Every structure is written in C-alpha cells, then in structure tokens.
Design a protein around this motif. Structure first.
Motif, PDB file in Angstrom:
ATOM      1  N   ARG B  63      -7.467  -1.020  10.660  1.00 36.18           N
ATOM      2  CA  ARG B  63      -6.603  -0.215   9.816  1.00 36.18           C
ATOM      3  C   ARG B  63      -5.165  -0.487  10.245  1.00 36.18           C
ATOM      4  NH1 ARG B  63      -8.655   4.787  10.727  1.00 36.18           N
ATOM      5  NH2 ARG B  63     -10.238   4.605   9.086  1.00 36.18           N
ATOM      6  N   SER B  68       0.587   1.365   6.093  1.00 32.06           N
ATOM      7  CA  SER B  68       0.155   2.292   5.055  1.00 32.06           C
ATOM      8  C   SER B  68       1.166   3.402   4.819  1.00 32.06           C
ATOM      9  CB  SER B  68      -1.192   2.906   5.416  1.00 32.06           C
ATOM     10  OG  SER B  68      -1.584   3.845   4.433  1.00 32.06           O
TER      11      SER B  68
ATOM     12  N   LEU F  17      -5.384  -8.636   3.527  1.00 33.25           N
ATOM     13  CA  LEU F  17      -5.832  -7.280   3.233  1.00 33.25           C
ATOM     14  C   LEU F  17      -7.107  -7.401   2.415  1.00 33.25           C
ATOM     15  CD1 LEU F  17      -2.745  -5.345   1.847  1.00 33.25           C
ATOM     16  CD2 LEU F  17      -3.361  -5.441   4.170  1.00 33.25           C
ATOM     17  N   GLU F  19      -9.037  -5.195   0.489  1.00 35.49           N
ATOM     18  CA  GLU F  19      -8.774  -3.862  -0.037  1.00 35.49           C
ATOM     19  C   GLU F  19     -10.068  -3.090  -0.266  1.00 35.49           C
ATOM     20  OE1 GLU F  19      -6.360  -4.322  -3.497  1.00 35.49           O
ATOM     21  OE2 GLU F  19      -4.545  -4.782  -2.370  1.00 35.49           O
ATOM     22  N   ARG F  40     -15.506   3.911   4.272  1.00 31.57           N
ATOM     23  CA  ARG F  40     -14.842   2.907   3.464  1.00 31.57           C
ATOM     24  C   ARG F  40     -15.852   1.859   3.028  1.00 31.57           C
ATOM     25  NH1 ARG F  40     -11.062  -0.651   7.670  1.00 31.57           N
ATOM     26  NH2 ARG F  40     -12.860  -1.571   8.755  1.00 31.57           N
TER      27      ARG F  40
ATOM     28  N   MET H  26      -3.079   4.366  -4.561  1.00 30.66           N
ATOM     29  CA  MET H  26      -3.510   3.434  -3.530  1.00 30.66           C
ATOM     30  C   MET H  26      -2.547   2.263  -3.501  1.00 30.66           C
ATOM     31  SD  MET H  26      -7.631   3.456  -4.079  1.00 30.66           S
ATOM     32  CE  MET H  26      -7.957   2.210  -2.849  1.00 30.66           C
ATOM     33  N   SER H  27      -2.888   1.207  -2.770  1.00 31.41           N
ATOM     34  CA  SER H  27      -2.040   0.022  -2.700  1.00 31.41           C
ATOM     35  C   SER H  27      -2.348  -0.852  -3.910  1.00 31.41           C
ATOM     36  CB  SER H  27      -2.264  -0.722  -1.392  1.00 31.41           C
ATOM     37  OG  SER H  27      -1.462  -1.883  -1.327  1.00 31.41           O
TER      38      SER H  27
END
Lengths: 50, 100, 50, 50, 11, 50, 33, 29, 50, 29
Positions: B63, B68, F17, F19, F40, H26-27
């Motif tokens: 993470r 973020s 990333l 996602e 997740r 979100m992203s």
C-alpha cells in the motif's frame, strides 16, 4: 572435500540477512501482524537502533 | 577561481574570485510526508480498545498511504493553495526552468 | 489440530512494553511498565524479560 | 588506562544446521501434518510462492 | 427563487 | 507484462499500480470495541495459507 | 462532489444549479453548481 | 424523525440531499 | 435549531491527550495515547492530529 | 428501457435527464 549437500556439514548459515515469503505475490507470510517485523524473517541485523 | 595552490597571503590572491553557494531549501515535506511510519508493518501504529488491545489497523507494504493522500487532496480540493497547518504546500517546479 | 487452537486475526506474538515512568537514583533506577494483556489472551510470565 | 576508542562487532556462527521455518500457524510442531497444511486441503486452490 | 435565504454577514 | 523503456545510466525502478478495491468495513458493536474487516480484490493480502 | 440528482428505481440527473443569464447576480439568489 | 436538527429555511427544515450520504471516489474509478 | 443539537453541559471542544507511554529511539520516536471518547460523544478521526 | 446500459450508482441506474437530449447553443441566443 566435504560435500555439505550430502553429509549435513553446513557452515554458511551465518550468511543470511532476511527472508521474505510472499504467497501469490500479495499475501505476505505469515502475515497477520505475527512477528516484530511481520512481513519478513529478519535473521540478523547489521544496524539495530530499535 | 583560486589562482595559487600555496597558502598565506600573496599578490596573486587578489585575483581570487568569489561565487555564492547554491541555494538549499531544507524543510519538512508536503503534508508531512516522512514523519509517520506508514506501510512499515514492523513500525505499524495501533488503534485498539483498551479492553481488547487487538489492533484494528492492518497496514500493508504494497500500500502507498502517502501517495493515496497526495492524490486525494488533488481531487477534493484546490491543490495550488497553501495550508500551513498540515504543511500543505505542493511541490511545484517553475515552468520556465523545466521547459526552456 | 485445526479448530480452536490458533486465531486468524491481526495479533502479535511478542509485544514491546516501554517504561511509563522511569525514576533514576544515583545507585539504582526504576522502570514502571503497563503489562497490558488484552482480551482473549494469556501471558506466561516466563516469556517476559527486560 | 591507555585503551583506544573502540567499536563493538557482534555476530553468530551456527554450523551443521538447516534454517527451519515451519508452515504452521503458531510456528510450532503440533504434528507432522500441520494445521496450515490441512487448511489448504479444504481450500482447494493453487497459490504461487515467491 | 423565493426560497433562497437572504445574504447576511456571517449567517 | 513487458515494458520497454528508454535507457538510463542509473539504477531505476518501475512503479506499477495494480488497481484494486482496498476497502475496510468498520464495526463497533459495544463500548470500546473496534472490529475491522479488510478486503482488497484481486491482490488480496490474506488467503488460506495465512 | 456529485452533480444534483432526482430519484424517479432509476437515478436521474437534476438540472438545478446550472448557469443562466440573469439580470441580477446569481450568487445572492441561488447556489450555482 | 431527526428533522428538528436541521436549520429551517423558512418554515421547512433544510434537509440535505440523499445523494451526499456515501463517497465513491477512487484513483480514476 | 434550538433543542437536541448542542448540549448544555460542561464539555470541551478540543481535548489534550498526554502520552501514556512515550519512547525515544535513536532512529524513531513512539508515542502511545489513550483516545478516550466519553459517553454520548462522537469523534471524527479527521479532527485528530499529533 | 435501456437501463442496463447505464452505470449503476448503487443498485439503480444513473440515467441522464430528459431535458438534456437536445441543444440550443447559438451565438448570442
């Protein structure tokens, strides 16, 4: 000489720093906040401040 | 420009020429990145009730809690503005310096 | 055994307890801790050390 | 009384042995067929190891 | 419209 | 995935990333109780191995 | 954070808050979103 | 009821919108 | 709104929480608190900071 | 009613508005 692969005369055990076991590339093992550094098996530390 | 390698005062040291040092801005990071151990589970923080003391924070090394929070402030606010309390001052180069 | 032996929550093995108040004399010192065992745990004091 | 300013080096040597990491939920030997080895029989899924 | 509240200083 | 980059005379990284849905659900059933379930997908941090 | 929405379920975008020509400044009358 | 906790614009309680109850950002999602 | 929004009892807006258990490593700092939310009080953790 | 073509915000389709189907954009009016 002696073959450590076949007789058990292992001697390079001190040459390990740490071990990171990650099942399936995201699940760190043992996970679950088990150890004091729970994502890797730190066998020895050169620089220890904590 | 040092004209002479020798020490002590001489006539040739009237030709030495002085240059200012490069400006170095040392400060805390934007939104206080780097103070707090995020995503280090060996240094993971705790929020737990005192009866149970079973940690409700399960942080991860893959993470990125800092990034973020950097991308979140862009979406819900004007990121060009400066908030001194959280040290919210975004890293921004000068557009004449990057692209000549 | 698999059932009702080991938990599957975020729980540590070793905890780091810090002195709440340290008092220092010329010939001794004093370390007061909060040895806080949370719910659904047991601590054998043989594993505790300084 | 003329000792130099010294720095300390620490290490260990552990010959003849294998660094065992057991695939158990509490790192103990409660049996040869461990509880995490039976958790993966009833999961019935393949995981990769890195 | 007519339901919009009136502008005052600080409320 | 097969990335092709410009060469640079410096050791560089590659920050991909993947996602996911890094979602927490927080339950507080009684006074002083703080229970959270993290999940997740796809790149979960918990499987049957842990 | 979210554009205004009616609920007839189906979820229908509401036209309130849009910009118009007004003889009087629109901030003292309405909220412009 | 919980409608007496709202400021009254006129004689009506100024209730917030039903669409502002959850977050969805979100992203890029 | 007049009633049932704001209390009439002696209650602080901003609270100050002394560390119960602070620690100064040469490489890090650790501070442990008691985040005591009293009866009939709610705390958004966005208003919390160090 | 083509509501399976709309992105679901929650359990309901995020349909548009009826009045947005046309255009009236014109220079000066």
């Amino acid at each position: 000489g002696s073959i450590p692969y076949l007789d058990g005369t292992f001697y390079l055990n001190h040459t390990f720093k740490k071990v990171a076991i990650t099942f399936d590339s995201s699940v760190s093992w043992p996970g679950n906040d088990r150890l004091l550094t729970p994502n890797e098996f730190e066998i020895k530390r050169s620089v220890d401040g904590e | 420009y040092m004209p002479t390698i020798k020490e002590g005062n001489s006539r040739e040291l009237m030709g030495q020429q002085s240059m200012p040092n490069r400006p170095n801005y040392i400060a805390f990071r934007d939104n206080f990145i780097g103070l707090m151990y995020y995503n280090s589970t060996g240094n993971m923080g705790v929020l737990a009730g005192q009866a149970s003391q079973l940690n409700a924070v399960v942080d991860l090394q893959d993470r990125n809690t800092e990034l973020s929070y950097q991308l979140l402030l862009d979406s819900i606010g004007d990121r060009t503005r400066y908030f001194s309390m959280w040290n919210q001052a975004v890293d921004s180069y000068d557009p004449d310096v990057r692209i000549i | 055994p698999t059932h009702d032996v080991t938990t599957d929550r975020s729980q540590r093995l070793t905890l780091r307890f810090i002195p709440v108040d340290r008092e220092d004399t010329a010939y001794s010192y004093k370390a007061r801790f909060t040895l806080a065992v949370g719910d659904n745990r047991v601590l054998d004091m043989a594993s505790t050390y300084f | 009384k003329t000792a130099v300013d010294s720095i300390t080096q620490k290490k260990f040597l552990c010959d003849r042995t294998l660094w065992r990491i057991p695939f158990s939920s509490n790192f103990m030997s409660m049996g040869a067929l461990t509880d995490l080895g039976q958790n993966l029989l009833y999961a019935n899924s393949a995981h990769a190891l890195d | 419209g007519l339901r919009f509240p009136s502008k005052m200083f600080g409320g | 995935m097969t990335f092709e980059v410009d060469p640079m005379d410096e050791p560089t990284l590659l920050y991909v990333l993947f996602e996911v849905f890094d979602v927490v659900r927080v339950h507080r059933p009684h006074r002083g109780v703080i229970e959270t379930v993290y999940l997740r997908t796809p790149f979960s941090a918990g499987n049957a191995t842990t | 954070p979210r554009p205004p929405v009616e609920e007839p379920a189906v979820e229908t975008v509401s036209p309130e808050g849009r910009g118009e020509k007004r003889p009087r400044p629109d901030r003292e009358e309405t909220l412009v979103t | 009821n919980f409608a007496s906790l709202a400021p009254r614009h006129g004689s009506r309680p100024f209730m917030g919108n039903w669409q502002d109850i959850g977050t969805s950002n979100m992203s890029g999602g």
